[PDB]
Design a protein around this nucleic acid. Structure first.
Ligand SMILES: [Mg+2]
Ligand SMILES: [Zn+2]
Ligand SMILES: [Zn+2]
Ligand SMILES: [Zn+2]
Lengths: 178, 171, 112, 557, 268, 97, 84, 107
DNA sequence: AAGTACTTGA
RNA sequence: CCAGGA
DNA sequence: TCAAGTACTTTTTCCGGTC
């Protein structure tokens, strides 16, 4: 038995179209902008820049360790060892995917502190740009507004070159000095 | 990229577990089944969020058998790669055919042909590397790749990617 | 309405003539079923068996293959609410014992 | 048993009926199905890559299925296909096809009447999918012209144009499996007098049906997804897998192929003749001849009991058993294999009465008890007892027949070398003999009553008859002039509860049939009861004491 | 044919009798919402007798020296004479009993008293009498209010339908109608004291038991009343041997909604 | 022995839902198939060992279920198919009421 | 849709069928070595154990009572009157 | 309402649904000699309002499909001039309950 | 043996 | 089918 | 147009031999 979603659509006999997934912002049916949470409320897609993601997972495993000990009653290279220890505590251990993920995240995160990831999240989610771009803008370090618009091609006409270049400056300024 | 997705999994619990540590075993079995998992529809289901509030609901007793079935509604962090996505990663393997790049849970492979012409294979090195006029790409090097396409393969997703286009390659 | 009253009167007589007693309700139900549609729906392949009940249930009496050929042709959808369908499906029918569902409550479970 | 499958287990909530698109038939197909020869790879005993397993289901019992892997008790067969050289009618749809032609234009594929006719828009309105098609027909049958212009939805002077085509519509009649039209004609305003008499080809009917608008055919019964009218005509015929048409494999080197396997080869053979005939120098009549024969075979395969008599008789006189015949009522599928079933844990013998059995019990012969079994789960509560019955074995009365391990494999206590040193584990099942006080379903056929099937307490007894309390005689409608009765044994704790809690004999005493008791005192006891209770009747001390002691709940007073 | 036509019919958790389409066949099972096993032929007293004989049996007139309840019947007998306030209650009582008489005479036109109804009230009284060792000499410790209101209250507790709304509430009233006429006939003041000679505790117990029994008497949602009804007609047909077509061949005519019947006849 | 139609009726009258299911399944016929979630057909090539699923023609290697039905119904369904009729089996509903 | 506890209108009493099914189910579970919510006062038959659990209303099961429309009222075995 | 002795020509009958929202009814004088409603077997039928109907369906959780149906041409449906969709409440005497209320929707 | 459904002559 | 049993 | 004829449909409780 495998996992299901909040997307209920009834594909009766009519198999296909399964139209390709590209950054023409045409992601899956599953990674659509209009999502639905377990409380039925229409809620927007949640995309994470690897740092926003690093923090989320760390937070979740930290809180899990709490309940696991409760139910039992009756510097980056330094973060890697600290995280690899938390994984030994909460995770199934067979889950090697999370181990690599956490290592990659620790080594590639642009913003260390939660405070930092706060401002990143503000500055960006005010552009009206779709969660995918807003994440790739947070996770890909670009200098020219062309570097950005080339790598994130979906952006193309969505933002001024200058407006994007102004953001790229105040993004570089937020980067935690590793 | 890297999403937070609301998901639900049906679990079929045997009567012997209809003790007070039921929710505890359900939340556990959920994590065993879902965490680590890799699907085509959702990608890599990496980490289940908010353990303390996993909604177990009421379990319907399956008639001829004893067991109860619950639809465990949860929320988790997923990684679903796409074609056109530009990603940063570390080289892992390197051969006369190209090089694999580790991007979180998954490996993205770069063909000798999906790189610029100047970058050429050097077998005569420990470990084997790719050499440009200016650059050197090997096992530890960090690279920015453009995903050309993905293949949903069992308990993983693998992809092909280029470093030929502008603003790609070594970092 | 009078059609119902006469139809019962008649049914009742057939039983009581033989000096037998069947409780009202039984005869009433039969009489009502023949009635409800708005006319005199017979207990024959023509009457009841030609109503809007599900194809599988209907095919279990008199016209089988023809009922299923039409089922296909007009893309009929079986609700799977009838006893008969569940018997054909090897499922517990929504009959007495199976007219409700049974759930464990972890609340009450942890309470005891 | 059957093996573990990771596939999520669900219940069928809906049955979505429909028709097969030829494309689907080709898609679901695991092989085509080109040679009438069953097997023998040029007489070399093994399935032919042409008929029954050119990738299909499987034979040999040993030797696994080629498409899935599983083999026999697990592998449902896999469907194949046969591309028919010409289109053919589905026997079952011949009249619905006729009626559809009667409703539509035999040239443009447009409804003979529409939104412009009042009676039509009214019948079109009908919500019931069948009743609307019924009404649409009685209206459109009569219309013998595809109209170009019809009077406007106001004035009959200025006629508004609907769909084109002015063509005259044939008067269709059936000539058994064939549809022949009689076009009205015009010739000097009169004619007919002598009309155009031609048979409508499958292919032409198929083409008109292909051109019927989705909106139009949807107004008729039809559904654009599951049942387009074009699908009543067969192009690509599905080939049912061996599990549907098994061979009765007598001895070693002897076939025994099913009628359906034969009838299929007939269809194959008919198809090849026609196929070669047309690809070659078409003698054009020898073609409509080879065609009509295939139409017949594909017809008689599904239904062999057709109006126009030729009964597609097997070489033995005996007619070939159609698929329709297989499902046709009482004995055969629905009624005989599904509404009713032959069942395990059943037992039957001559009944006899007993004044010494309790109302709710049933005397069960030792032999019957020693055969019928209850699968009991090894649990701390029963473990020791169960181990003893296991030790007792299949021959001793309170004994057991099988041990079912967690592993799934069955231990036969009759032969297992470890039938002695068998050490039980919680969760295992001991298939033990039926024992005193087990709830069992007792039944006397006919069974025109809920009281004709009641739950009794077992009482293992000697002698070969089922013993019943005399007062329970009436509900069953039994006597002891040579009557036999049926016994069914529940296999689950749930099932047992159902019997004991809903249908046990005491519960059944006062019946809702006539809101009164359905069991009373009979015969000897009724006769003796009058005799005992007369004023004249006095009993001496000696007998009073025996009469008192005889009452099992007597206060001792 | 009876079985196949009825199979899918059963009582749902709304007391409604429906088929596999959820189409209502009967609004409430057998028009009374009761299980057939829990029913017994009982005599509706009120129905027959002379208008004078009824009067003697039911009328209490505390404002007339001859038609009062003798102080031998109950303790309050002496203090009860001339109570205008109390007489208002016995007037309601008698007026309802008269209402009921007319009504029952409308239902059962022939005047047939014996009908199958739930709760054998006759037996409950009999039991109260041995259970409480009822002294057919000494006067009762009951009030007129104890009897009159006690019954009025018990009636509100005879639940067949539960919904909180006019439709369902009016429905409940309807289903319970007939049983109450019986209840009011068997539990009228004069009857309880003169005939039954019940004490307050005896009466209190009789009331609780009618309630309990009545509730046990209702049909159980899940009851496959369809098959039941089919078999309840089917089985008796199996035992079947002006001159009009009758028995098995007539039942055949009936079920088939036979157009050209064998013995057509008018009864003018 | 035959637990026939009239016996089915008595069980239905009793309200013995699970006792009936048992007689018809466990005590006789009972079989397990794999069906497709798109076209509710017994098409699924269950290579349950290698844990491969597939309903080619649907190209569905994902949306697959398992069901327990009497083998005679698996038969009946295969028979209705051979006769060009589609008895599509669905594990969810779409109509309500 | 699920009817709120404050708007439930089905019988406050347990149906014959409900009780037979609860007893069946518990007995089945008890027999499959499920945890028993009562002192077995020497009891060994899972139905007699089930009867005992229901006798003290220590059965942690709920009856989902479906209405012809599809809606339902959930009732606890603890809350259902057992006059049967 | 048009009470006719013997017949109404099909010419005249074609003018019946010609003037809506107003409605026309044809009654053969011979049928009306006896009021069928007065018969032993004919119980009280009561026509429900749009609100009363809406309520019935709400109270029993019904679709109009699920209600027992009075046929449009029914002698009583004619007497009451019931229209398709309109609902009647039948109040019959019961040997079971004394009074039983059934409902019928128009065809 | 008794129906529906459809066809045929006045 | 044929012969029989309640 | 409408009576009367036509085709064709449909059932019937449960449990050895000889082929
Ligand atoms: Mg006999
Ligand atoms: Zn296979
Ligand atoms: Zn045309
Ligand atoms: Zn499929």
């Amino acid at each position: 038995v495998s996992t299901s979603t909040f997307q209920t659509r009834r594909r009766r006999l009519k198999k296909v179209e399964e139209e390709e997934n590209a950054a023409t912002l045409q992601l899956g049916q599953e990674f659509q902008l209009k999502q639905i949470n377990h409380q039925g409320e229409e809620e927007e897609l949640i995309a994470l820049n690897l740092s926003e993601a690093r923090l989320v997972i760390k937070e979740a495993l930290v809180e899990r360790r709490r309940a696991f000990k409760r139910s039992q009653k009756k510097t980056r290279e330094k973060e890697l060892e600290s995280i690899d220890v938390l994984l030994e505590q909460t995770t199934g251990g067979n889950n090697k995917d999370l181990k690599n993920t956490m290592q990659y995240l620790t080594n590639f995160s642009r913003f260390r502190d939660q405070e930092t990831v706060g401002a990143v999240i503000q500055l960006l989610k005010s552009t009206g740009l779709h969660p995918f771009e807003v994440a790739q803008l947070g996770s890909l370090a670009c200098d020219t507004a062309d570097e950005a618009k080339t790598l994130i091609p979906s952006l193309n006409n969505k933002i001024s070159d200058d407006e994007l270049e102004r953001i790229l400056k105040e993004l570089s300024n937020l980067e935690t000095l590793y | 990229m890297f999403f937070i997705k609301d998901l639900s999994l049906n679990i079929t619990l045997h009567p012997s577990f209809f003790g007070p540590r039921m929710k505890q075993y359900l939340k556990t079995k959920l994590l065993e089944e879902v965490e680590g998992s890799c699907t085509g529809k959702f990608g890599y289901i990496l980490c289940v969020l908010d353990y303390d509030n996993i909604d177990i609901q009421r379990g319907r007793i399956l008639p001829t058998d004893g067991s109860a079935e619950f639809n465990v509604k949860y929320r988790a962090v997923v990684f679903k790669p796409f074609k056109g996505e530009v990603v940063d990663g570390t080289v892992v393997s390197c051969s006369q055919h190209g090089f694999e790049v580790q991007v979180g849970p998954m490996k993205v492979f770069v063909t000798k042909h999906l790189m610029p012409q100047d970058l050429t294979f050097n077998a005569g090195s420990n470990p084997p590397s790719y050499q440009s006029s200016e650059d050197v790409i090997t096992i530890k090097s960090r690279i920015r790749v453009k995903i050309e396409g993905c293949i949903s393969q069992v308990s993983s997703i693998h992809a092909i990617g280029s470093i030929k286009e502008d603003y790609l390659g070594a970092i | 309405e009078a059609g119902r009253a006469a139809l019962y009167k008649e049914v009742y007589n057939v039983i009581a003539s033989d000096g037998s007693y069947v409780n009202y309700r039984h005869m009433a139900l039969l009489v009502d079923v023949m009635t409800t549609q708005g006319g005199l729906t017979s207990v024959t392949r023509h009457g009841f068996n030609r109503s809007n009940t599900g194809a599988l249930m209907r095919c279990s009496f008199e016209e089988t293959v023809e009922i299923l050929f039409e089922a296909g042709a007009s893309a009929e959808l079986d609700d799977c609410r009838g006893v008969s369908e569940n018997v054909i499906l090897g499922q517990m029918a929504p009959i007495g014992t199976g007219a409700f569902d049974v759930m464990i409550d972890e609340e009450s479970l942890v309470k005891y | 048993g059957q093996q573990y499958s990771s596939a999520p287990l669900r219940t069928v909530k809906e049955v979505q009926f429909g028709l097969f698109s030829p494309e689907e038939v080709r898609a679901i197909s695991v092989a085509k199905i080109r040679f009438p020869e069953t097997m023998d790879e040029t007489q070399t005993r093994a399935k032919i890559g042409g008929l029954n397993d050119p990738r299909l289901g499987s034979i040999d019992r040993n030797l696994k299925c080629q498409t899935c892997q599983e083999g026999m008790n697990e592998c449902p067969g896999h469907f194949g296909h046969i591309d028919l050289a010409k289109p053919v009618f589905h026997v079952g749809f011949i009249a619905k096809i006729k009626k559809v032609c009667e409703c539509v234009c035999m040239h443009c594929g447009k409804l003979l009447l529409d939104e412009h006719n009042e009676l039509m828009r009214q019948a079109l309105a009908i919500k019931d999918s069948k009743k609307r098609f019924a009404a649409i027909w009685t209206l459109c049958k009569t219309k013998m012209v595809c109209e170009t212009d019809v009077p406007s939805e106001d004035d009959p002077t200025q006629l508004v144009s609907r769909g084109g085509c002015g063509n005259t519509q044939p008067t269709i009649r059936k000539d058994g499996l064939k549809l022949v039209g009689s076009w009205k004609k015009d010739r000097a305003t009169g004619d007919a007098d002598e009309p155009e008499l031609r048979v409508l080809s499958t292919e032409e009917i198929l083409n008109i049906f292909k051109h019927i608008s989705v909106k139009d055919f949807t107004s008729l019964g039809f559904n654009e997804v599951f049942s387009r009218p074009e699908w009543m005509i067969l192009t690509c015929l599905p080939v049912p897998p061996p599990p549907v048409r098994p061979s009765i494999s007598f001895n070693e080197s002897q076939r025994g192929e099913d009628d359906l396997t034969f009838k299929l080869a007939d269809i194959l053979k008919a198809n090849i003749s026609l196929e070669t005939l047309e690809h070659n120098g078409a003698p054009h009549h020898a073609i409509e001849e080879a065609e009509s024969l295939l139409q017949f075979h594909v017809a008689t395969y599904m239904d062999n009991d057709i109006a126009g008599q030729p009964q597609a008789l097997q070489k033995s006189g005996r007619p070939v058993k159609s698929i329709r015949a297989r499902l046709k009522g009482k004995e055969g599928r629905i009624r005989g294999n599904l509404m009713g079933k032959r069942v395990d844990f059943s037992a039957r013998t001559v009944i006899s009465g007993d004044p010494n059995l309790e109302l709710d019990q049933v005397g069960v012969p030792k032999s019957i008890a020693k055969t019928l079994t209850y699968p009991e789960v090894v649990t701390p509560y029963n473990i020791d007892r169960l181990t003893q019955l296991v030790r007792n074995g299949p021959n001793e009365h309170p004994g057991a027949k099988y041990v079912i391990r967690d592993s799934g494999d069955r231990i036969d206590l009759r032969y297992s070398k470890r039938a002695g040193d068998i050490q039980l584990q919680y969760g295992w099942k001991v298939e033990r003999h039926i024992m005193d006080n087990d709830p069992v379903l007792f039944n006397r056929q006919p069974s025109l009553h809920k009281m004709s099937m009641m739950a009794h307490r077992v009482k293992v007894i000697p002698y070969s008859t089922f013993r019943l309390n005399l007062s329970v005689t009436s509900p069953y409608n039994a006597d002891f002039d040579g009557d036999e009765m049926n016994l069914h044994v529940p296999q689950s704790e749930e099932t047992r509860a159902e019997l004991s809690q809903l249908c046990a004999v005491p519960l059944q005493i006062v019946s809702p049939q006539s809101n009164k008791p359905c069991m009373g005192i009979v015969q000897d006891t009724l006769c003796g009861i009058r005799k005992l209770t007369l004023r004249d009747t006095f009993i001496e001390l000696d007998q009073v004491l025996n009469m008192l002691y005889w009452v099992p709940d007597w206060d001792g007073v | 044919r009876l079985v196949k036509a009825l199979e899918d019919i059963m009582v749902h958790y709304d007391n409604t009798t429906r088929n596999s389409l959820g189409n209502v066949i009967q609004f409430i099972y057998g028009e009374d919402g009761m299980d057939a096993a829990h029913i017994e032929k009982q005599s509706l007293d009120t129905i027959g007798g002379s208008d004078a004989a009824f009067e003697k049996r039911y009328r209490v007139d505390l404002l007339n020296t001859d038609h009062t309840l003798d102080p031998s019947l109950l303790e309050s007998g002496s203090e009860i004479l001339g109570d205008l306030k109390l007489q208002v209650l016995l007037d309601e009582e008698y007026k309802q009993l008269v209402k009921d008489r007319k009504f029952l005479r409308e239902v059962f036109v022939d005047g047939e008293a014996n009908w199958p109804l739930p709760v054998n009230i006759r037996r409950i009284i009999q039991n109260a009498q041995q259970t409480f060792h009822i002294d057919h000499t000494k006067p009762s410790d009951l009030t007129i209010k104890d009897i009159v209101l006690g019954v009025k209250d018990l009636q509100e507790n005879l639940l067949v339908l539960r919904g909180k709304n006019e439709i369902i509430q009016n429905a409940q009233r309807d289903a319970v109608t007939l049983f109450c006429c019986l209840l009011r006939s068997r539990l009228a003041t004069r009857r309880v004291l003169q005939e039954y000679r019940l004490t307050k505790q005896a009466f209190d117990w009789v009331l609780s038991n009618i309630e309990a029994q009545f509730l046990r008497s209702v049909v159980h949602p899940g009851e496959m009343v369809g098959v039941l009804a089919a078999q309840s007609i089917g089985e008796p047909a199996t035992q079947m041997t002006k001159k009009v077509t009758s028995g098995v061949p007539r039942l055949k005519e009936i079920l088939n909604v036979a157009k050209n019947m064998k013995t057509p006849s008018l009864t003018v | 022995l035959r637990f026939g139609e009239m016996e089915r009726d008595c069980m239905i009258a009793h309200g013995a839902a699970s006792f009936l299911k048992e007689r018809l399944m466990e005590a006789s016929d009972a079989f397990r198939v794999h069906i497709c979630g798109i076209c509710g057909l017994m098409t699924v090539i269950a290579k349950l060992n290698h844990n491969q699923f597939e309903c080619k023609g649907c190209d569905n290697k994902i949306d697959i279920y398992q069901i327990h039905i009497p083998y005679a119904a698996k038969l009946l369904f295969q028979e209705l198919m051979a006769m060009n009729i589609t008895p599509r089996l669905y594990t969810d509903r779409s109509r309500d009421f | 849709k699920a009817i709120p506890k404050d708007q439930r209108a089905t019988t406050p009493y347990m149906t014959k069928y409900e009780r037979a099914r609860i007893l069946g189910t518990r007995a089945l579970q008890i027999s499959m070595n499920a945890p028993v919510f009562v002192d077995l006062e020497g009891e060994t038959d899972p139905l007699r154990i089930a009867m005992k659990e229901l006798a003290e209303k220590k059965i942690p099961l709920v009856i989902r009572r479906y209405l012809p429309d599809g809606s339902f009222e959930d009732w606890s075995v603890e809350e259902l009157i057992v006059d049967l | 309402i048009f009470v006719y002795q013997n017949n109404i020509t099909p010419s005249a009958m074609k003018l019946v649904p010609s003037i809506p929202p107003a409605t026309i009814e044809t009654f053969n004088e011979a049928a009306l000699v006896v009021n069928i409603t007065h018969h032993e077997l004919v119980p009280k039928h009561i026509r429900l309002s749009s609100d009363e109907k809406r309520e019935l369906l709400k109270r029993y959780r019904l679709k109009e499909s699920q209600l027992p149906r009075i046929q449009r041409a029914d002698p009583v449906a004619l007497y009451l001039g019931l229209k398709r969709g309109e609902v009647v409440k039948i109040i019959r005497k019961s040997e079971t309950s004394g009074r039983y209320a059934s409902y019928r929707i128009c065809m």
